[PDB]
Design a protein around this ligand. Sequence first.
Ligand SMILES: *[C@@H]1O[C@H](CO)[C@@H](O[C@@H]2O[C@H](CO)[C@@H](O[C@@H]3O[C@H](CO)[C@@H](O)[C@H](O[C@H]4O[C@H](CO)[C@@H](O)[C@H](O)[C@@H]4O)[C@@H]3O)[C@H](O)[C@H]2NC(C)=O)[C@H](O)[C@H]1NC(C)=O
Ligand SMILES: *[C@@H]1O[C@H](CO)[C@@H](O[C@@H]2O[C@H](CO)[C@@H](O[C@@H]3O[C@H](CO)[C@@H](O)[C@H](O[C@H]4O[C@H](CO)[C@@H](O)[C@H](O)[C@@H]4O)[C@@H]3O)[C@H](O)[C@H]2NC(C)=O)[C@H](O)[C@H]1NC(C)=O
Ligand SMILES: *[C@@H]1O[C@H](CO)[C@@H](O[C@@H]2O[C@H](CO)[C@@H](O)[C@H](O)[C@H]2NC(C)=O)[C@H](O)[C@H]1NC(C)=O
Ligand SMILES: *[C@@H]1O[C@H](CO)[C@@H](O[C@@H]2O[C@H](CO)[C@@H](O)[C@H](O)[C@H]2NC(C)=O)[C@H](O)[C@H]1NC(C)=O
Ligand SMILES: *C/C=C(C)/C=C/C=C(C)/C=C/C1=C(C)CCCC1(C)C
Ligand SMILES: *C/C=C(C)/C=C/C=C(C)/C=C/C1=C(C)CCCC1(C)C
Ligand SMILES: CCCCCCCCO[C@@H]1O[C@H](CO)[C@@H](O)[C@H](O)[C@H]1O
Ligand SMILES: CCCCCCCCO[C@@H]1O[C@H](CO)[C@@H](O)[C@H](O)[C@H]1O
Ligand SMILES: CCCCCCCCO[C@@H]1O[C@H](CO)[C@@H](O)[C@H](O)[C@H]1O
Ligand SMILES: CCCCCCCCO[C@@H]1O[C@H](CO)[C@@H](O)[C@H](O)[C@H]1O
Ligand SMILES: *C(=O)CCCCCCCCCCCCCCC
Ligand SMILES: *C(=O)CCCCCCCCCCCCCCC
Lengths: 326, 326
Amino acid sequence: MNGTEGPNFYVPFSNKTGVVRSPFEAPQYYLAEPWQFSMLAAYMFLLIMLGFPINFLTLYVTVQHKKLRTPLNYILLNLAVADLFMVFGGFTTTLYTSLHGYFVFGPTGCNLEGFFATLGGEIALWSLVVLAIERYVVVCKPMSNFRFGENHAIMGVAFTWVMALACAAPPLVGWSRYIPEGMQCSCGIDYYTPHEETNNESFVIYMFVVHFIIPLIVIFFCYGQLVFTVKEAAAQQQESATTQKAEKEVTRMVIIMVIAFLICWLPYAGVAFYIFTHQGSDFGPIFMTIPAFFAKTSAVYNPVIYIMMNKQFRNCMVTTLCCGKN
Amino acid sequence: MNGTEGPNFYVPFSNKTGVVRSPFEAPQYYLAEPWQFSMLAAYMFLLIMLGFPINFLTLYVTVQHKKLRTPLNYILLNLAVADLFMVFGGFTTTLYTSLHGYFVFGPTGCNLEGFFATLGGEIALWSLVVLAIERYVVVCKPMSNFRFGENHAIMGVAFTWVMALACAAPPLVGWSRYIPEGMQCSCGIDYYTPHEETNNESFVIYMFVVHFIIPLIVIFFCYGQLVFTVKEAAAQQQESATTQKAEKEVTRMVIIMVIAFLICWLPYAGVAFYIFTHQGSDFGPIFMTIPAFFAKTSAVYNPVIYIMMNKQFRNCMVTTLCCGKN
Ligand SMILES: *[C@@H]1O[C@H](CO)[C@@H](O[C@@H]2O[C@H](CO)[C@@H](O[C@@H]3O[C@H](CO)[C@@H](O)[C@H](O[C@H]4O[C@H](CO)[C@@H](O)[C@H](O)[C@@H]4O)[C@@H]3O)[C@H](O)[C@H]2NC(C)=O)[C@H](O)[C@H]1NC(C)=O
Ligand SMILES: *[C@@H]1O[C@H](CO)[C@@H](O[C@@H]2O[C@H](CO)[C@@H](O[C@@H]3O[C@H](CO)[C@@H](O)[C@H](O[C@H]4O[C@H](CO)[C@@H](O)[C@H](O)[C@@H]4O)[C@@H]3O)[C@H](O)[C@H]2NC(C)=O)[C@H](O)[C@H]1NC(C)=O
Ligand SMILES: *[C@@H]1O[C@H](CO)[C@@H](O[C@@H]2O[C@H](CO)[C@@H](O)[C@H](O)[C@H]2NC(C)=O)[C@H](O)[C@H]1NC(C)=O
Ligand SMILES: *[C@@H]1O[C@H](CO)[C@@H](O[C@@H]2O[C@H](CO)[C@@H](O)[C@H](O)[C@H]2NC(C)=O)[C@H](O)[C@H]1NC(C)=O
Ligand SMILES: *C/C=C(C)/C=C/C=C(C)/C=C/C1=C(C)CCCC1(C)C
Ligand SMILES: *C/C=C(C)/C=C/C=C(C)/C=C/C1=C(C)CCCC1(C)C
Ligand SMILES: CCCCCCCCO[C@@H]1O[C@H](CO)[C@@H](O)[C@H](O)[C@H]1O
Ligand SMILES: CCCCCCCCO[C@@H]1O[C@H](CO)[C@@H](O)[C@H](O)[C@H]1O
Ligand SMILES: CCCCCCCCO[C@@H]1O[C@H](CO)[C@@H](O)[C@H](O)[C@H]1O
Ligand SMILES: CCCCCCCCO[C@@H]1O[C@H](CO)[C@@H](O)[C@H](O)[C@H]1O
Ligand SMILES: *C(=O)CCCCCCCCCCCCCCC
Ligand SMILES: *C(=O)CCCCCCCCCCCCCCC
């Protein structure tokens, strides 16, 4: 007996000494010291201070620079909006609760925060997929007489919101549920508790397959091709130093992008899988926080990688920030 | 009666209800709510997470790039080291104490932390002065047949450490003192308490004049000249678009640098002056924290302005960070 069950939640601490309380009703200072709640507040604060400017800046600079407003950029705009859902839905809420030491908004708040945070990171996730598809389509030209334009970009964005809803909506209404995670200050998808009234086991399998394996496969295929096409075109122009350079740059980028996706979701998927495999397991509140640390902090590193390492976006940002020019 | 005096300290809260304790002995949760101590921890955490990389990166990239290692850069290296004194002396200590809710290292810790933090921000301050001198000397050439080289750079750096010691050493040994400030979690120079055994009034006057007015005057003169010289040289080459550009760039930079210096020290100087002028004053623990907020956060904005807006440093940083090249 390593936890304490409740109608709407699961505290990863044993109530044998009688001290465990509802994460909706009282401070959880028995599963982690107050300073650790503060450190949690500190990290949310960092994630807001960096996450907000980076992502808001992206939106804003696009409104101000025509050249950025191409169809192939729509998805990165989408990325930034997802990141903001995480910032205002997840990060700010967690900062507030962590300092109370429990999830003060009760179960319906737990649904709200869990939804918008989950919806955010999901849109972000599928955005990174759609992009890989779109890039591959544009570079490898797998369809004869096709030109990627506005309408497709819209489809890509919409597809992103549908795939996300297919994850974040079910728990609101019977298939899995939203319960406080880790240190009980923020709510996520119940992917660790055997709870059968809601059908957690089938949902976790659905998530693992449809929302992690499918995405991981599409990304590897799409970018595998992309790199192959680019490497092949350069072996056929070894006289252009430009072309050799672009090829190396495109390759380093893909490796960064792929590794970055793994860093972001492997822990959630990895932990989910272990807990599923090893039926009876005891993981603490801090351990169970690590998956969120990795995913959430991508609201910063994603736009650094996909937006700021881009030559164009960078220029406009500097212009917009320096009021005039240089 | 707005405070509570003690042999080694001054708590900005009235002990009429009997709740005030030594900032060396017990949590000060009567002068600010625990969450506010956490927010204090949060901000120190931010300042470490940004402050350390920015400033360490500066040092490290210099070790790796010959072109950076010029005499006119020695002072910026010095700036970065000052910033690190603030990071390890001030920021980390404050993070630790803020979470205890009082200055747990006692009075001798109060001396240590107060010294290294003060020494840091002081070296930083005089570094920004010496640079203005050096630049003006190099651009305005006020001395016939003079070339700024290594030996001078060394003098500049040393002068910086002497001016700083002239500020941070006296309080250790009788002229003013170090006492917990604001929320009582960090120690600074006693510039607000009338305490006469140590001679606070003469020290504050010394600080205000020698360490704020002198610096502010030298910076305005030096850079005033610099801009004048550059503006004058360009009115005489209006056919070079380069030259007109450099002139605008040099002017925007000086305005940024000068404003930045004001933002950094005006609050400490301004508050110090008011309290001196208005003899009997009551300022709270949070208000009295604002001067440190402005100064400390310069461990981030100084290197952003003086190091990262520089074209060279930027290039090498990107090279060093991208393992190889671009
Ligand atoms: C973790 O462990 C602790 C202990 O097992 C547990 O906390 C306990 O919860 C029970 C209720 O489930 C509390 O019982 C109450 O105690 C008060 C004493 O002030 C009683 O008056 C309450 O009313 C009862 O008796 C009345 C008789 O007239 C009835 O009218 C009324 O309906 C109730 O029967 C009630 O008995 C108990 O005090 C706490 N114990 C502690 C140590 O706090 C806790 O709920 C467990 N955690 C989780 C997350 O489930
Ligand atoms: C802010 O206000 C409060 C109240 O004014 C003040 O706290 C008080 O400090 C005094 C000591 O200066 C405490 O007095 C002690 O109380 C205990 C009770 O447990 C006594 O036993 C102590 O010993 C005395 O009596 C003994 C007789 O045998 C002597 O041997 C011994 O030497 C002492 O005379 C002592 O009296 C008092 O308890 C607190 N009060 C509270 C409410 O905490 C506080 O110091 C003020 N703050 C600042 C920063 O100065
Ligand atoms: C809760 O308590 C312990 C972990 O402290 C678990 O027991 C471990 O797992 C199996 C028993 O199924 C043993 O082989 C291990 O030796 C135990 N590990 C350790 C480190 O002692 C137990 O399974 C947990 N049960 C639940 C329901 O959470
Ligand atoms: C402490 O208490 C009050 C501030 O709350 C101070 O009184 C103010 O200053 C002068 C009196 O010298 C009055 O003209 C103002 O009206 C008061 N201000 C307010 C807002 O009430 C007092 O001087 C303070 N004294 C010390 C020693 O700290
Ligand atoms: C603040 C925390 C957030 C936004 C967490 C979001 C987490 C997910 C969308 C998790 C997804 C997955 C699982 C539930 C388990 C299997 C693998 C994933 C990554 C698809
Ligand atoms: C963490 C806080 C630090 C490092 C604060 C440092 C503050 C000073 C060196 C303050 C200097 C001044 C005064 C004490 C009053 C007059 C004006 C100044 C700015 C020279
Ligand atoms: C960024 C703004 C965050 C403000 C956080 C304020 C947290 C209030 O924190 C505390 O909650 C406890 C129980 O929940 C109570 O015992 C305390 O009285 C209350 O101060
Ligand atoms: C989605 C996964 C794609 C991984 C990126 C492809 C990695 C190819 O890596 C390349 O391998 C070549 C040898 O064949 C080397 O010559 C190159 O230096 C290296 O960049
Ligand atoms: C980054 C690491 C910071 C660790 C901060 C741990 C703070 C310990 O905080 C607390 O101090 C109080 C009195 O001072 C005690 O009442 C508590 O028992 C103790 O936990
Ligand atoms: C140390 C303080 C130096 C302040 C920088 C000098 C400000 C000069 O500012 C300049 O004034 C000119 C008009 O004479 C304008 O034509 C320029 O646009 C403007 O840059
Ligand atoms: C228009 O021309 C204005 C441009 C001036 C911008 C340069 C100032 C750099 C400031 C960086 C500050 C970072 C501080 C973060 C800590 C909270
Ligand atoms: C050598 O070539 C390696 C270069 C790869 C660097 C690109 C990755 C960007 C990471 C930014 C992460 C910021 C996260 C801050 C939140 C704590």
